[PDB]
Symmetry: C2
Amino acid sequence: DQAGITGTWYNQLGSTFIVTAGADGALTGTYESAVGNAESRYVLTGRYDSAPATDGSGTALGWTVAWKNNYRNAHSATTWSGQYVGGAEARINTQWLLTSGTTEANAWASTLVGHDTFTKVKPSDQAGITGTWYAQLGDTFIVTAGADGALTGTYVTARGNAESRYVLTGRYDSAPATDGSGTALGWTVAWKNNYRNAHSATTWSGQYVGGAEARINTQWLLTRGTTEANAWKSTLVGCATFTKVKPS
Amino acid sequence: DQAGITGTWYNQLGSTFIVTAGADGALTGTYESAVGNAESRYVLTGRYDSAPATDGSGTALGWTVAWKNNYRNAHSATTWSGQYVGGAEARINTQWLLTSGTTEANAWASTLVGHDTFTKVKPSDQAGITGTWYAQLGDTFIVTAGADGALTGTYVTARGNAESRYVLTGRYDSAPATDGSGTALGWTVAWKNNYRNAHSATTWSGQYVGGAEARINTQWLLTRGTTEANAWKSTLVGCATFTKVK
């Protein structure tokens, strides 16, 4: 629900995020984290299902924060993937992936995973990235990396309940480390366009590695809006690798 | 933590598991699930760090349940990876991976992810799998699949804080589907042996696909024992693909 989502949400750690849900499925806002290498507000962007199911399922959504602002750069990004559940005790229940830019030797250790629950009640490489990317599955990701750390574009998926292009939005570390680490980034796609609504959203969290064989290596979370009884099985997890060379 | 871990644990869904922690780092017991395609008890096996850190960190552990018993076969396995925290309100905080055996075309949708918290107080044999497997990183997994769905063996890791062999235990679906879906399975390694103790455990959850190029395609969770303040960053996630050819 657009009115249900917009506002201020608090999670179990004490972090805060303020979000505006646009009528078109956009999420925009700021996140302030009570833990980790973080200080003050960080830009957040994401998507949500603007036509959720009426059988009582939650509303699938996700969003991304690149942990760079004017005070700090943690060379990392987090994506939350989850669902909004309305009512007197409204909640956003998520799982998240936190990727650090790493050397290729430490990439196997690059991604933390966790869960966050948010309530309305306060508790007690721009050039390298911009362009067209191809997954091992055959689908396609066209993205523009802004100078501010914005990612914007469209995703065309070769598999699943999906058809034609979907809007994508995300963030990336716009001042990566120079020691050969990759560039942390993430983005979200809500699987609703003018042709289909799969009542679901995916977030990819990962890092860009430049050079002769440039890659975006990601892990992803796909959450479906579910009833509360089915929520334990609402989130799929996977990995995906994108290259600039269209596969065979 | 042998005495602390052993006994009966309840999670927020109403599921129950009973476990015995052995002195060597073994976990053995049964899991009864309050949700999903499950009914009565299922065998569980796993590992835990039998010499945790004394600074107050939790105790890393993991375990596997293949969702097949004499009453049902859900063609699936779950691994929980997490850490035991002792004291007046002892808990086991986990994240879990549930893999279903799927066709190749559906494999991208094969693995659910979630989190479970357990407390002590109740709330209100495949010839295909057995052998040596090699990951894209260079490390090595030697396993014996028992006829009862047991997995036992040793894991030798080519990366991280590890050296030589570590004990592994796990489970697999011993009566898979014959439509060409993979065989669901999972296993645990606690990263402690006679040479190193990394105070951590990894669980792989995934599926075995047979034939000319047999593979085990997995996703894994690596949990480190942490302080309560650092618990939010205790678990790494990744994927690993194993083949029979080095």
